[PDB]
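Issue: ligand-bound run for guanosine-5'-diphosphate - logging full I/O for the record.

Environment: standard queue, default settings, no custom constraints.

Inputs:
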Amino acid sequence: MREVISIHIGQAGIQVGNACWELYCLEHGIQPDGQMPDAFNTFFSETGAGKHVPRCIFLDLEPTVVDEVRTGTYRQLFHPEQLISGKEDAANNFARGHYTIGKEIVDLALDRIRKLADNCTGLQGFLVFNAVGGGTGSGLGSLLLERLSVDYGKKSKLGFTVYPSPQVSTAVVEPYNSVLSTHSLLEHTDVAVMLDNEAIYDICRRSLDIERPTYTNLNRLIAQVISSLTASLRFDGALNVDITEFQTNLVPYPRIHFMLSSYAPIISAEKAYHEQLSVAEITNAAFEPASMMVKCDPRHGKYMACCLMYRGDVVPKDVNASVATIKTKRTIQFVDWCPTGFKCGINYQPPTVVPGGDLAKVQRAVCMISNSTAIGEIFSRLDHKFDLMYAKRAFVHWYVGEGMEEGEFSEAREDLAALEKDFEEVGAES
Amino acid sequence: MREVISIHIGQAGIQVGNACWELYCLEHGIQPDGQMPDAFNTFFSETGAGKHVPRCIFLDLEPTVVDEVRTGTYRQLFHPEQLISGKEDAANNFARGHYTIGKEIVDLALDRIRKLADNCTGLQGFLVFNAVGGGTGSGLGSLLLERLSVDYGKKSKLGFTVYPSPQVSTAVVEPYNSVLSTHSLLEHTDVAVMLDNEAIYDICRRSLDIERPTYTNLNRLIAQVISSLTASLRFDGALNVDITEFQTNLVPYPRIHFMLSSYAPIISAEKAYHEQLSVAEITNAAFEPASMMVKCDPRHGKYMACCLMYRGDVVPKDVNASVATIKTKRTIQFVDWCPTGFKCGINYQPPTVVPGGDLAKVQRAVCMISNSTAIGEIFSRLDHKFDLMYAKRAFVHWYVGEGMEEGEFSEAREDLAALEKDFEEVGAES
Amino acid sequence: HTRPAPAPASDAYAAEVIRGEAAGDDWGPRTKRSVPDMPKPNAFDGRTDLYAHMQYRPLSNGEQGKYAKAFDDRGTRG
Amino acid sequence: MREIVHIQGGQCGNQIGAKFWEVVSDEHGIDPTGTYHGDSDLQLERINVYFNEATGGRYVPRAILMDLEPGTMDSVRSGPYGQIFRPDNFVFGQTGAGNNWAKGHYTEGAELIDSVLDVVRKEAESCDCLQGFQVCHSLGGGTGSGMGTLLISKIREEYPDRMMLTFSVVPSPKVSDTVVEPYNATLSVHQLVENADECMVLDNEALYDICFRTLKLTTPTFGDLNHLISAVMSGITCCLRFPGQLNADLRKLAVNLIPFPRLHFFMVGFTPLTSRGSQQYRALTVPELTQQMWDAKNMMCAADPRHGRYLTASALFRGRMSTKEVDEQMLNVQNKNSSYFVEWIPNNVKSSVCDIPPKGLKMSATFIGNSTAIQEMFKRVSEQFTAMFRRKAFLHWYTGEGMDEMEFTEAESNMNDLVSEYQQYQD
Amino acid sequence: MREIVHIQGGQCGNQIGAKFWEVVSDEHGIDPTGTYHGDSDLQLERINVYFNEATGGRYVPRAILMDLEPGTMDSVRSGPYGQIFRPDNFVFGQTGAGNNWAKGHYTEGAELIDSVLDVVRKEAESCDCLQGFQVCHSLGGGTGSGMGTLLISKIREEYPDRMMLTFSVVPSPKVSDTVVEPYNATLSVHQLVENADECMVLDNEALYDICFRTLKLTTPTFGDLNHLISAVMSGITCCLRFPGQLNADLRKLAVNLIPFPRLHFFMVGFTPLTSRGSQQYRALTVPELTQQMWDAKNMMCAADPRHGRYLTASALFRGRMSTKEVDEQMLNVQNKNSSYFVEWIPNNVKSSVCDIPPKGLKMSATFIGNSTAIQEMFKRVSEQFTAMFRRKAFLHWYTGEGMDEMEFTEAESNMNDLVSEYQQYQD
Ligand SMILES: Nc1nc2c(ncn2[C@@H]2O[C@H](COP(=O)(O)OP(=O)(O)OP(=O)(O)O)[C@@H](O)[C@H]2O)c(=O)[nH]1
Ligand SMILES: Nc1nc2c(ncn2[C@@H]2O[C@H](COP(=O)(O)OP(=O)(O)OP(=O)(O)O)[C@@H](O)[C@H]2O)c(=O)[nH]1
Ligand SMILES: Nc1nc2c(ncn2[C@@H]2O[C@H](COP(=O)(O)OP(=O)(O)O)[C@@H](O)[C@H]2O)c(=O)[nH]1
Ligand SMILES: Nc1nc2c(ncn2[C@@H]2O[C@H](COP(=O)(O)OP(=O)(O)O)[C@@H](O)[C@H]2O)c(=O)[nH]1
Ligand SMILES: [Mg+2]
Ligand SMILES: [Mg+2]
Ligand SMILES: [Mg+2]
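Outputs:
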């Protein structure tokens, strides 16, 4: 039986995970106490009689984001040893989450991952949720990902990470914390899906006509993208896409493995009645940069490998005609050496709507995860933000004093400088 | 007819045995007064009509702890004269418990053993519960071990001794009394099953989730192991492993006979509803170093021979599938000359739960009782305490007065030194 | 006279299996759910199969008017 | 009393045989529970070509469904007419080849080949006369192409005197479904030339087009597409299952359609394709089954047959028909357009008539064409393979399971070699 | 009119025979009360082979139960079909051997061997003409291994003109069930090779893989294993209990299966094993029972028969079958793969036909084969003993109870001779 393990690290990880597992329990009919009144084996672990346990852990050094899960409406759902807390947070410091307080808790992190991996029969990959801005998501995620490649070799590891926006960011050492994270998520994480908070602010602004979006609204459709990514395991359809199928189709080179994300239908409860939702409309909607979930413009770069995972009443012919209409457009430009850029997946389960949520019930939905050379704009800008702040040694004594040395800033900068060289070299036309 | 008698000497011995016959009277359904409203034949004597007396003796030099048994909840169940008292305690001195004041009370203990063995048809083995850190348990326990060896010769004896921990220990002359006891155990006790208090404190802290463990909580789950290692005689299963099997299969050499302990499913009431407890999962928890009842690292040593007893509904095949997964793991090791190293025992009766106890009703249970070469480390640290302390002739005036001689610490030193020579030599490859 | 203890109570009964007295169903639970009504019955007459075209069945009188009015399977354009 | 053993791999192979064994079953009149309730005596005469008789009237096929995921068989577990199969013949994997040709062939391939060939060997010895082995799989995928093409090479080693029908679908030129599509296709055709004896070329874009302009359907599912493929596979062995005025078995087509041993890639066609709107108005006589046989729109391959010459063609007619009308119509197509046929072979057309039509149809015919226009399909896949290999993109996966670039250069060498001899014969 | 004396030893063979007398009584048709209620008169014709008459229609089997602990005697008595057993044949001790070869053989076995030889001779004298001595025990334990090899040594001295089948379960290589298994295994086979005329060696891992891969059974117990060994054990003496077209007794087995006195080691198997839901798809015919007969997976031994050439073979067919059809796969398995058989023995396979099938089955067969793959079974035990006796471990439980280390060296003297001679004829 197929199974995927999701680790939730840092403040973004749990708050996505509360939205992620809320979407998961409504799909399988499982109530919040854990009782369903044959496909739950992907995410839920059956124990006893009529009890389902999520196959996930909440790892965060700050206890005040985990305790609200331990006292909320999901008390009876999670296993209490899966919820791993700590004495004090890493305080957006990469050195604390990696050296000082990170090593004191990562031993207990592997103790339950091994328990989750032993209960699994057939494992296909890992999900990791973190934010590189904060040192719990950045440093402890770097420590856990480095350890997992040593502990569980050659297995898939899905990186659902959140990056600082160009114009928007809510911390000061985020240029410092993102660059040091890119030394680990380059050489360990095999598939990394960038997310960006301001692009989802814009997505919630126009498509969902919400003037005042919050962190709950953003993470609810974060849950929609991941659930659409792994709906192929849980339900049957025309063209299934497995985790290792997902990894060999979109990673042409072992370092060129960062991919975009786009969920096409975001419609309100009042605009759903007036929109004629067909597979031609949603496929053109996904490639629009308005529906792009990261603040980058794909027109500058080249699309290199794309996958389109369809949910609902999608018949296999016009979706094959919808891809042809995308290829004819000069705006969506592909790289020269790849004449076959599209992967297609169709599942027959329409996306569930949470009660009290903001999304409307749609009969068709597509999620695009695409590898592009326009993601170099994400890294080069965060490279410029780091290079300006490092030039006068700002916020270094906090990082150096907690175990680090100055030499790890030069290695991480050189590693990220190779990525910008690699993106330009790969995307060059010959 | 299977029958095993148990003796209980020292403050550890009675208080462990208080919980031992608390669980023993619950498995057979007998009320605490002594009436059942023939697996009870191996632990209870059918006395007339409706009356039953346990086939064990309680004995202590201190008159304190016997009275709270005599005036506790088990005044009617126990035999009034099987309870053996004393004028005064041995007071942390091996000299007092073995020579001066235990001698006037050992002979009243010897005849009641003869009264117990004459009443039963066929006896199987000897169980002794004591602590070598004190005077009464180490002194009269060794004094009885001389007498039962010469009287009831060559009979299988299995011992449960509460040794000092390297960190937590409650007496200053405690390393003296352990060294003097070990000179008696090696030539006389067949298989010595080790115990340690703070390892059971640790297994109450992280597993049962109680932050205030006491001596009552430790002895309650010690009795779970004692019932599990004698569960083959009481209830029927696949592979019956009696006490005669246990010695001849698990001790390789006359001077190499020490033993570890484990009990993997140790789960509170709230924790039980989420754990999926299969044979494969409970097997992996027993061999992990965190779940043993003495603080020694089995990674530091090498296992010599192992024995596993399974209780509850265990099918006889995933026990063999778990063994194959155990032996293929590199983190567990065996000595090179012992290829066949596991004894399988399956019983069908699940462990009972005491009312008010923190242990929940679990349908499967495994106890891992294994010889190891890591027991040299718990004997090296305890001998390191003695050599640094005997160099100044400290605390000797208490010892030489009550029948001991000054030189007797030297033969007990080289006897433990010979044991350390045995443990290092047999773990060496060739 | 040892105390009876409950069996694991498997559904195995290999004697019954090897004699073939009880058939049962050896297959496990079906995975990947079971989606209802996918692929959908088409509008402009309910077509869930190509059996009509591959068996050359005659058109019914209650359905002949649809193809009288329209050419393709898109419904009632005019 | 000759037999065909059916073996299938991947997502594409298993879904076809879910419909293929469905189409065969009601032609022979046996229920999904397996019992026979047919009204014709001629159905039970030749059942052994495709079914094992069992106790109580059960009929179980020579079907060996191979996959590396439990997902495909789960559809076969619950799909219609999926209970007829032998449960022992469901060899399965757990890891999944992951759309990788290297994983299905070399590294993870070896753990299941010794088990799947055991199921094949049990069925091969049970039936007496083996006409050949029939496989249905994909080429752009990795589970049914990577594991399948090694299985074809192994079974030619054990049984070298038996024919090999392969119904392998092809990467579409207009559209694409996977990203490593030309990688897994060129590695499979490089092996399909050496082991397989005859190949039927299929692709979804021609099956999509043939459902639009010939059937007037704007919503074709895969199950609609699998039915037209399943009609072709029944038409090849319609001579074995049923009598006829002129008989042509599987090996008779092999000596007809294959002039030289490497030219075994054919294109298929099914004749009575009528839309329901225009169903009544068309008549059923041999001249109008022939006029839809030779149409370029009726071909279920990418290649336009108007571009290349027909080296040899075959026709598998089914029905009560005049032998002249079979003969004269296929003689008229040798005179009306003789520039589309090869001059240095006389009478490029093989014809055969079976007196038992399919269910409901008064007449039917199946076309197999060894055209040299198939080089247009093989050129495009080789064009995509050289584009991605010269950048070495998506190659760090294939070298991960134990491949070096020697056979990748060899695969392009044999691909360029086989397309070179097609264009040499076209001049 | 020939009868078999059955011996059960230890906690294994008592539980083995509890399921073995379940099958034989049900095959002969007696209820748990003991009265006969079968519908076949031929079923009651040969009852003296396995049961004895009693006043009132009761039937008491002629077998003994032997161990040193009364706990396992409570299991066989309280279980199903346990009330039929002779209370006088319940010979048992109180100490328990405790997995030691010394206890059951010399020290505490001696007070029970003299008790059981008085018991064993009672049915030996009461029965009219002895045919053989079946035992069922283990070699890894001490209750039935060390005590059993003394009884089989003692019973041959009194009765040196009879054959003896032994059914001894040998310790498995993959899984360890007792630490001192290589002691008791080497010392028991040391007694058997001088004494045991023939032997059916089994193991627990083969019965696991049979009941997983073939029976497709999820969580089985030992009652499922003890039925399959009972299916073999009843099939050994099918020709004695029932008439047939060609009958073969224990000596017919012996005369055709041991070319040399020291090469007496066999391997067993039960042929018609089908899954829980696969019995409606099978075809119960003589081609496919022989297909399951010679498969390596189907054998009940740790040895792989493809590794070592078969020195000889046996077949115990039961049911209604064509003797020509029986002879033609048995000739086919000689010719299709002759490289896996010995060359200096023509007609390597013996066959027999019994006219009565087992209960609930139309046809069945049992294979007995002396091969040089049991060479691989002893090499693991010889590797275990030699790599461990060098450090003289665990000897204080042995040398303190009556025998010296020189006996252990003598166990190395002949077990190294057994492994030498089996490999010699392989060349
Ligand atoms: N989309 C989304 N982003 C979040 C959410 N919570 C936090 N973030 C992002 O996380 C960044 C802050 O860094 P974090 O990784 O959350 O900090 P942390 O996890 O608390 O790490 P420590 O402070 O060391 O404990 C912000 O810039 C946000 O963009 C959330 O609920 N949804
Ligand atoms: N686990 C456990 N250990 C105990 C218990 N009671 C006493 N001990 C141990 O016994 C040690 C003291 O040695 P004892 O021989 O029992 O002391 P004593 O029996 O009163 O002998 P004297 O001190 O000479 O009177 C302590 O260090 C404890 O670790 C108990 O109830 N449970
Ligand atoms: N006719 C048909 N083709 C299919 C179906 N499913 C997938 N395919 C084709 O298979 C190709 C992809 O190969 P894939 O299914 O991944 O092969 P696999 O990896 O062996 O399972 C695509 O070009 C599809 O057109 C189906 O149900 N019917
Ligand atoms: N197949 C089978 N094997 C058994 C059974 N009981 C015990 N065994 C095997 O016997 C071995 C233990 O030896 P044991 O039976 O105790 O020998 P004993 O001490 O002489 O009675 C283990 O390896 C078990 O696998 C049974 O009922 N069936
Ligand atoms: Mg925080
Ligand atoms: Mg005291
Ligand atoms: Mg002919």
